[PDB]
């Protein structure tokens, strides 16, 4: 058979770059796909297809991050141009990790099956890139290329900038021109489409481009599909957006045609670097999930990318689990335990915003026992999780807000549904579960000093220690007190 990069060789329009935590990209690849680091000896491991041309080996890696947590630290280049993507490095912004790096996704953010096989793509909170400076064989200059990527065109903001592609080789603003990439989100600073977001643009640095217009473009449409195919493709004054629903059908073209006529766009001054989920100056406020993409050298016929869009489709990407463990039910009235050793007769409770754990028993105040008491609720940011309401105080949930947990009100918001969903997972110590942040799935419900955070397991955060991490994340599903 033929895979996206073998369909775009035959198109004399080769990938230069190609990355997927999903599968191979090529018939005939049966090298490592990504590389995992984990949190309890900071060792890492590769993952690689099940057979030449196929799918992740998501088992190898379950098992590698068995009672601990993953990183991605290497989207590796299947290519053989040597173009991985590490770990963002600082630029015109800082990022929020050590020496203003950004930070390594989650390995287990973004389950899906690809025809019924289980795998993981790069589930990026704000905060989290990748990128490659020292790339070769992309395209720079006015050069033709083309790229596209599979994402969760759900799972989006409108921060600067979750991008994928061409950028700039210092990490720095060097002005218009200086980038093309990939752009997904409802950021309306620059350009946007028809209705309320999300929408396919184009980076080309200083510019969000929905296009030919700076702003409006009526022909880009809000993207409601769970998986989406953006295409886009620059050359020699002419570029092209195109998106599909990775799961059904074609491509359409919400533009082609020639630079926006805006000075510093015609010719462009491409730099060759490769940037995933961040702008070309580190503008690393954005979140997104990529599953699979490439760049090419030359501009790809709008046939060349239907044989793409057909073999993506046949890929069958469907929505994976991401609960494990004993979970819970919709309307259940739970107490939470701590399980970490002197400190196994504690129960997450709160003091008004501040939650926290106390000693809760029997003889406890029936004000101590309610605010130890959740009742559990359909995630709000993802059905399949779980949102935690306070007994005491309906309509206030456990949301996390600079990494602290506290209990707020929902005020209907999509940012507060987010920090308030949470996706149960075996625990890591194997006394009941382990909470995970679905907006930011390296944090975890965490006591340190009897204070509740969404921690990582190692971090930049004083409660990110990794010194009794497994136990600090791990509690009993009890009765609740009240
Ligand atoms: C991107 O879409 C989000 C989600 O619809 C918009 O969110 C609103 O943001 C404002 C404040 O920025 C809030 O007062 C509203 O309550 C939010 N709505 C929801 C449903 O959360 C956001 O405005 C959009 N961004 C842009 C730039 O248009
Ligand atoms: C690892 O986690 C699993 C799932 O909770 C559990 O069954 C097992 O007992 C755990 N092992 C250790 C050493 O914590
Ligand atoms: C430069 C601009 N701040 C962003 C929008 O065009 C781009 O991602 C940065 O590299």
Not at 38 to 48: A, M, N, P, V
Not at 294 to 312: C, K
Not at 434 to 460: C, D, I, K, M, Q
Request: charged share 15%.
């Amino acid at each position: 058979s033929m895979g996206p990069c073998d369909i775009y060789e035959a198109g004399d329009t080769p990938c230069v770059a190609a990355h997927s935590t999903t599968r191979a990209l090529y018939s005939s690849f049966s090298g490592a796909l990504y590389q995992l680091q984990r949190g309890s000896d900071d060792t890492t491991t590769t993952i690689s297809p099940l057979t030449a041309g196929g799918i992740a080996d998501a088992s190898a890696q379950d098992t590698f991050c068995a009672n601990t947590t993953c990183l991605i630290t290497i989207i590796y280049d299947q290519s053989g141009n040597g173009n991985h993507l590490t770990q963002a490095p600082p630029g015109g912004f800082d990022g929020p990790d050590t020496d203003g790096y950004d930070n390594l996704a989650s390995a287990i953010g973004a389950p899906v099956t690809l025809n019924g096989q289980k795998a993981y793509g790069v589930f990026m909170s704000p905060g989290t890139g990748y990128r490659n400076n020292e790339a070769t064989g992309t395209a720079t200059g006015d050069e033709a290329e083309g790229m596209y990527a599979v994402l969760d065109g759900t799972h989006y903001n409108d921060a600067c900038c979750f991008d994928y592609g061409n950028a700039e080789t210092s990490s720095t603003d060097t002005g218009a021109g200086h980038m093309e990439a990939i752009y997904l989100g409802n950021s309306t600073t620059w350009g946007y489409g028809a209705g309320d977001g999300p929408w396919i643009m184009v980076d080309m640095e200083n510019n969000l481009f929905s296009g030919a217009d700076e702003g409006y473009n009526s022909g880009d449409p809000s993207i409601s599909y769970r998986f989406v195919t953006a295409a886009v493709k620059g050359g020699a004054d002419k570029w092209a957006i195109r998106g599909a629903n990775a799961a059904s059908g074609s491509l359409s073209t919400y533009y082609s045609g020639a630079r926006p006529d805006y000075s510093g766009y015609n010719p462009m001054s491409k730099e060759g670097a490769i940037i995933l989920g961040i702008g070309g100056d580190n503008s690393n406020g954005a979140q997104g999930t990529f599953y699979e993409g490439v760049m090419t050298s030359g501009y790809p016929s709008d046939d060349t990318e239907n044989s793409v869009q057909e073999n993506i489709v046949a890929a069958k990407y469907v929505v994976g689990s991401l609960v494990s463990g004993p979970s819970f039910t919709s309307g259940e009235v739970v107490s939470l335990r701590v399980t970490t050793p002197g400190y196994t007769t504690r129960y997450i409770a709160h003091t008004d915003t501040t939650v926290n754990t106390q000693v809760v028993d029997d003889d406890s105040s029936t004000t101590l026992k309610e605010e130890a008491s959740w009742t559990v609720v359909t995630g709000l940011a993802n059905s399949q999780c779980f949102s935690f309401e306070s007994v005491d105080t309906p309509g206030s949930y456990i949301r996390h807000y600079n990494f602290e947990l506290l209990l707020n009100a929902n005020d209907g918001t999509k940012q507060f549904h987010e920090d308030a969903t949470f996706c149960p997972q075996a625990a890591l110590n194997g006394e009941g579960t382990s909470l995970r942040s679905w907006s930011y799935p390296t944090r975890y419900f965490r006591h340190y000093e009897n204070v509740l955070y969404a921690a990582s397991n190692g971090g930049v955060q004083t409660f990110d220690s990794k010194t009794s991490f497994n136990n600090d994340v791990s509690f009993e599903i009890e009765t609740a007190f009240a």
